Amino acid sequence: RWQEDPEPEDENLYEKNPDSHGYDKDPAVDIWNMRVVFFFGFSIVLVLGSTFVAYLPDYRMQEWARREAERLVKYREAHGLPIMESNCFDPSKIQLPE
Amino acid sequence: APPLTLEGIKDRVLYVLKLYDKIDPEKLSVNSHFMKDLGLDSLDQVEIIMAMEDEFGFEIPDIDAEKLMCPQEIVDYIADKKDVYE
Amino acid sequence: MLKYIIPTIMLMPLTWLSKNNMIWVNSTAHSLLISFTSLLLMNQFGDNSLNFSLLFFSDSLSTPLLILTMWLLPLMLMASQHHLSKENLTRKKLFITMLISLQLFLIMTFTAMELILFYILFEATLVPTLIIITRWGNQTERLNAGLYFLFYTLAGSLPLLVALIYIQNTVGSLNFLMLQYWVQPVHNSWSNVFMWLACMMAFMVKMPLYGLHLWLPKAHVEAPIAGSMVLAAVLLKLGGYGMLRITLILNPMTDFMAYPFIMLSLWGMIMTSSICLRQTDLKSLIAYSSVSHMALVIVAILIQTPWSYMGATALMIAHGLTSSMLFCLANSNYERIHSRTMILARGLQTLLPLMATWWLLASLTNLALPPTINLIGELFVVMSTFSWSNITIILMGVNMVITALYSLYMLIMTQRGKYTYHINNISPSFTRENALMSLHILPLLLLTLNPKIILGPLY
Amino acid sequence: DSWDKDVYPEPPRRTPAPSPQTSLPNPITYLTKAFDLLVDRPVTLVREFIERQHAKNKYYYYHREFRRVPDITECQEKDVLCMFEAEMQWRRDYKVDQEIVNIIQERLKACQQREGESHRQNCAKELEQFTQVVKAYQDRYHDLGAHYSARKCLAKQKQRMLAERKAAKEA
Amino acid sequence: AYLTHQQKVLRLYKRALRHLESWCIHRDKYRYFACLLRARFDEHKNEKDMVKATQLLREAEEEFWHGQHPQPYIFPESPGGTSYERYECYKVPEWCLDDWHPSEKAMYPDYFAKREQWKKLRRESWEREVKQLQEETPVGGPRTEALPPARKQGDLPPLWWHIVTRPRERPM
Amino acid sequence: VVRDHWVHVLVPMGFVFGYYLDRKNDEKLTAFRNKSLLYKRELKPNEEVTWK
Amino acid sequence: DKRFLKLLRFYILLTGIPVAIGITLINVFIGEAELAEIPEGYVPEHWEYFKHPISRWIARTFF
Numbered sequence A: 001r002w003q004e005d006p007e008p009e010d011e012n013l014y015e016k017n018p019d020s021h022g023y024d025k026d027p028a029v030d031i032w033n034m035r036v037v038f039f040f041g042f043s044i045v046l047v048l049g050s051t052f053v054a055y056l057p058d059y060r061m062q063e064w065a066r067r068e069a070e071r072l073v074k075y076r077e078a079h080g081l082p083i084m085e086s087n088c089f090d091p092s093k094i095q096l097p098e
Numbered sequence B: 001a002p003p004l005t006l007e008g009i010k011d012r013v014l015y016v017l018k019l020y021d022k023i024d025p026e027k028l029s030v031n032s033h034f035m036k037d038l039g040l041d042s043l044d045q046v047e048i049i050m051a052m053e054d055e056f057g058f059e060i061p062d063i064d065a066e067k068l069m070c071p072q073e074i075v076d077y078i079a080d081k082k083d084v085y086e
Numbered sequence C: 001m002l003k004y005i006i007p008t009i010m011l012m013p014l015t016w017l018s019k020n021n022m023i024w025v026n027s028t029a030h031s032l033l034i035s036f037t038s039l040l041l042m043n044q045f046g047d048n049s050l051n052f053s054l055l056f057f058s059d060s061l062s063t064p065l066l067i068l069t070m071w072l073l074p075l076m077l078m079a080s081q082h083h084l085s086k087e088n089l090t091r092k093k094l095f096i097t098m099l100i101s102l103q104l105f106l107i108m109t110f111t112a113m114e115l116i117l118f119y120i121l122f123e124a125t126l127v128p129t130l131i132i133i134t135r136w137g138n139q140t141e142r143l144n145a146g147l148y149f150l151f152y153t154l155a156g157s158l159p160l161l162v163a164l165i166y167i168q169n170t171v172g173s174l175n176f177l178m179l180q181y182w183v184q185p186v187h188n189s190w191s192n193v194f195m196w197l198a199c200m201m202a203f204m205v206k207m208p209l210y211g212l213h214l215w216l217p218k219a220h221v222e223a224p225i226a227g228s229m230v231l232a233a234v235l236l237k238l239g240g241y242g243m244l245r246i247t248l249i250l251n252p253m254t255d256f257m258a259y260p261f262i263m264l265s266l267w268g269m270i271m272t273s274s275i276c277l278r279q280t281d282l283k284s285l286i287a288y289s290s291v292s293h294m295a296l297v298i299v300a301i302l303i304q305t306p307w308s309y310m311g312a313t314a315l316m317i318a319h320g321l322t323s324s325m326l327f328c329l330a331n332s333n334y335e336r337i338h339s340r341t342m343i344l345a346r347g348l349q350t351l352l353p354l355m356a357t358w359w360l361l362a363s364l365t366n367l368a369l370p371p372t373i374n375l376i377g378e379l380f381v382v383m384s385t386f387s388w389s390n391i392t393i394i395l396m397g398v399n400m401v402i403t404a405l406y407s408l409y410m411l412i413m414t415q416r417g418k419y420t421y422h423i424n425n426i427s428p429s430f431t432r433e434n435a436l437m438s439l440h441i442l443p444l445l446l447l448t449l450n451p452k453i454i455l456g457p458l459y
Numbered sequence D: 001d002s003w004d005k006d007v008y009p010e011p012p013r014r015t016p017a018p019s020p021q022t023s024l025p026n027p028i029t030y031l032t033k034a035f036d037l038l039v040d041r042p043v044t045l046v047r048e049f050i051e052r053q054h055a056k057n058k059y060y061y062y063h064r065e066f067r068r069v070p071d072i073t074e075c076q077e078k079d080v081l082c083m084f085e086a087e088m089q090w091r092r093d094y095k096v097d098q099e100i101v102n103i104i105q106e107r108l109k110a111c112q113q114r115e116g117e118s119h120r121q122n123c124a125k126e127l128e129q130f131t132q133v134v135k136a137y138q139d140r141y142h143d144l145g146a147h148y149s150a151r152k153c154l155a156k157q158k159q160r161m162l163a164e165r166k167a168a169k170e171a
Numbered sequence E: 001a002y003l004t005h006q007q008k009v010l011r012l013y014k015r016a017l018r019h020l021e022s023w024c025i026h027r028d029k030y031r032y033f034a035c036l037l038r039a040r041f042d043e044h045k046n047e048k049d050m051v052k053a054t055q056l057l058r059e060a061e062e063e064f065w066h067g068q069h070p071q072p073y074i075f076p077e078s079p080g081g082t083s084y085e086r087y088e089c090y091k092v093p094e095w096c097l098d099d100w101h102p103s104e105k106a107m108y109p110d111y112f113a114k115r116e117q118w119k120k121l122r123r124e125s126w127e128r129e130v131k132q133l134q135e136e137t138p139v140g141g142p143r144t145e146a147l148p149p150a151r152k153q154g155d156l157p158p159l160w161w162h163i164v165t166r167p168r169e170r171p172m
Numbered sequence F: 001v002v003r004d005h006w007v008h009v010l011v012p013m014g015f016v017f018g019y020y021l022d023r024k025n026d027e028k029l030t031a032f033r034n035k036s037l038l039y040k041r042e043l044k045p046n047e048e049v050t051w052k
Numbered sequence G: 001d002k003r004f005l006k007l008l009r010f011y012i013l014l015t016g017i018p019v020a021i022g023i024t025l026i027n028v029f030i031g032e033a034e035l036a037e038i039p040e041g042y043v044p045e046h047w048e049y050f051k052h053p054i055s056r057w058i059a060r061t062f063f
């Protein structure tokens, strides 16, 4: 064996502080800890961050691509050209082997 | 469902026993032992418990049932199960 | 990235110079402010990634992982400050320093433009992670868990170091932008078979790949709650993120080298899902749940399709928040009853009605209830593996069934039934515990309204 | 109006004039009049108020114009500076082509709903146009993989051009 | 089996009547067949030979298994019944009230005043209850789960709290 | 400046300092400012650089 | 439980309501940009390619 301290009992934060938020034993620190978590966590990051994300300018140009495609289809159909050609690159700029 | 009372439970426990042809309704009392006083056997006591279950709509397990030996014991058992305190 | 690296370092002076009773308030508040500013990384373009300097860049793959990493630091602080209350003050500040330094290595790891800078930071995360597990774990086995975590990783990483340096010699660069243009195909040969293995085994161990996963249930069961949160949410995703980048230079050899690892993942996911049905330890159940989910990510990365890469990116983010939530939920029970035995404390919905709501929401995301991003990620992967081979829907279907069985079994066993009579210290849920749970589920459910920002570069 | 009728065409509307063959009052007629009175009018005035404020603050935004640069065919091997621009241009065109297929798909689906039980015969042009564009999109971009690039696209085309040449030689 | 021979016969009699009732349904028809079934038990009531009596029990049980109703009637709140454990979700242990916020306790000043007397009564009695169980238990621990009554005035029957304060069968 | 609230400038200053350093890096990477084929143009009458 | 949900609502609404009102006033009195052709010889600023004023503000201020 040895000289050892016994296992301490369980402290229920509610006994000393029935209004405890579970952050700190000091009631004033416990209130402030709750306030920063809620204000900075919910009011700022989650509410403003959600608003910021909703109004992101054309994330990855998906809207421009849709506007551009409209421009091309309008042009090509009017001029009788295919909407889309099978060849991505102009075949005159390619030199096949053999 | 209407609540039960100790007086109400006793009335119906006796009521059922007064409709059993093997008991004498005048000689019956809450404290009558089914064998020592009323002279029934154990096969009869199983039937009495069976009839009490049918009367109140719940089952008394055989381990508990074999000990209920007078009408007052049945009244006490039912009251305890149904949380009847008056 | 210096607008994030520097304020992350400044969290260390802040913690050490804070009043003795304000270390948690100050570190939590200012780490939330850093999380707020990380949203500026979502200035992404359709064609070009966001390249800041010769050292750091941020595309659509690393941006959501960075935001997940910086969001997790405040959550880890909230989750730890209860069980560290009796800790010595200096040893509380050293604990927080280990978490801050982990965030620092992590945000630099996800934005390193050069792969050998990625390797060093990727490896650097081991030290703070190992110290957290072995110093602040509770059981005897935390020491063995540290060794398994350390040596499983290093067994794979050291071959990766040789392969990357060999790649720099032959190609002349390891800059990821340069690799996109200078990549040459890999032709069959035993020499390239082992170059492929060296490049992928380090990441397979981190995911982990089924068979190589034994370190993970050990580490989770022994780590403190904050360690388990970062382990599941982010550190597993270092394997996925690394694989999504390195596979660029492994083509077309990935066509046939993938087969043994797809087989392990497709079958492994059913095996680890079924293990969850018979786990007796709640944390171990959640650990094995991660293996099953990360099996899908491995398959998706290896079949190399636009839909599979989108699905893998969403799965990594969705799993990060859900698995972190589940560990936090199980921890709140543990802080009361001080055991991880799942069957010990039952019928808790009677005693903690609101915490039972969190248990429900966490389970629903874990089984991928639509339209959660858990379902978006898992569905996109299943669509792409079906085109890879139709028969995979059989294995995908079964896993979905077994995943629901163990998710609701965990809910039913702990929350429903009758409460355990002799357990009488189930105190009402603290505000800290409820706010911790909501800071997991609310952002996870909010991302359903706008899922494109977690779908990765191929969106 | 709001969009371009050429890009999103709608065949001219044909509405049969009411031919009531019953003495009874039609419930839909009066509910329609109530809807215009109780919903449309108040909603219309509220909008006109908002349209007045916008007219007092008129400002503009533009659709970006992307100059054309040399494509990957004109880039020297391992010349990153020219490859980068050709690669970025190819990526922009890939997104645009994706939205072209979406437009043609949108026409196809609008036609299927508009024509009702006659859609099978009255949406033959839309189906044909959709079939052709999906063939062109498949030829350009299908099977390139997650790590697609202008180089992989070009290599796929050259392989296709080679096959077409050889069959033509057989003729 | 710890059940005596008498207990087995009486248990079989009850179980046989209940399954007979499920078959018959109608009360008049059940009464007719319950009496014939009773007559069979009365037939061997006096069998003094244990070997034969046990043999009669074996065949009787074999016959019951063949004739048992596949879907017998069960009282709704009995194990296996349609209302078994229906109300467990409403039974809350009384120790949950120690955690109530003071503002919650202020709403029931009279209930929590009484509750304190019971908790006071529980502390005062505990030591004597442990002592009584120490003095009445033979060396080597108890041999049965039976518990003693109180032997004096002012004593409470040992281990009474969780029987007396258990949740009502219809709590909410 | 207070004896309770000077530690709350460290992280905000670190962000501002990091922001400043990030922009100074862009001053080292102007080799192609107004020289790419895609965006090369003529300067406006008052403009000195297309971006800074 | 009730206390947490009341605190959760208060801190969501503490910024949620001003943001929702601020958005309404922006949509109504400022409104959106109109699509136009780029005038000859005019080089728009990078934030003039977006419609919503809040999107324009985000691109101008941060990006």
Ligand SMILES: CCCCCCCCCCCCO[C@@H]1O[C@H](CO)[C@@H](O[C@H]2O[C@H](CO)[C@@H](O)[C@H](O)[C@H]2O)[C@H](O)[C@H]1O
Residues within 6 Å of the ligand: A026, A028, A029, A032, A036, C019, C021, C022, C025, C026, C029, C033, F004, F008, F012
């Ligand atoms: C843009 C960056 C914004 C950063 C925002 C950071 C928010 C941090 C919020 C913490 C605010 C707490 O501010 C607090 O104020 C009081 C008065 O000065 C200090 O002093 C107080 O100490 C104790 C609290 O334990 C009180 O009971 C006592 O009345 C008072 O002396 C606290 O030590 C300080 O912690």
Ligand SMILES: CCCCCCCCCCCCO[C@@H]1O[C@H](CO)[C@@H](O[C@H]2O[C@H](CO)[C@@H](O)[C@H](O)[C@H]2O)[C@H](O)[C@H]1O
Residues within 6 Å of the ligand: C188, C189, C190, C193, C257, C260
């Ligand atoms: C988890 C572990 C996963 C293990 C996966 C195992 C994959 C096995 C891949 C086997 C194919 C290796 O690739 C193969 O190697 C030999 C190298 O000698 C090459 O062939 C070369 O060597 C052979 C000798 O055997 C010569 O006959 C041949 O003329 C020469 O070119 C082949 O051109 C190549 O197709």
Ligand SMILES: CCCCCCCCCCCCO[C@@H]1O[C@H](CO)[C@@H](O[C@H]2O[C@H](CO)[C@@H](O)[C@H](O)[C@H]2O)[C@H](O)[C@H]1O
Residues within 6 Å of the ligand: A051, D057, D058, D059, D060, G018, G019, G020, G021, G022, G023, G026, G030, G053, G054, G056, G057
């Ligand atoms: C309440 C939620 C807050 C979320 C955070 C967003 C905060 C910023 C909100 C308002 C942003 C300012 O909104 C701004 O309105 C003016 C309208 O004059 C627009 O400006 C436009 O009109 C003005 C005339 O007034 C002209 O200079 C010019 O035609 C054009 O710039 C801006 O493009 C837009 O950015």
